[PDB]
């Protein structure tokens, strides 16, 4: 339930609204969190395009925001 990326890039948790990313990891965007800026029906699939998506990173158990062009969606 919601859009689910894999980390491309790695990441380093800077801002303490951002979190550590690392090629490999796995990103758990819910759809409303992401939508929750205005985006378009579509548009939540392309975190390149997006800017930044707040995620679950599984690999490290963290939630936060992250550079979506370091990511990208694969599907639910």
């Known amino acids: ?7 491309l ?7 303490e609204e951002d979190i550590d990313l690392h090629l490999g990891d796995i990103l758990t965007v819910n759809k409303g969190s992401l939508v929750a800026l205005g985006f378009s029906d579509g548009q939540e699939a392309r975190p390149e395009e997006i800017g930044w998506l707040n995620g679950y990173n ?5 939630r936060g925001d992250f ?4 990511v990208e969606y694969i599907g639910r």
Not at 67 to 70: F, I, L, R
């Open 67 to 70: 550079p979506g062009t370091y």
């Open 9 to 15: 890039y790695d990441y380093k948790k800077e801002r």
């Open 1 to 7: 339930e919601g859009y689910q990326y894999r980390a």
């Open 58 to 62: 599984e690999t490290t158990g963290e």
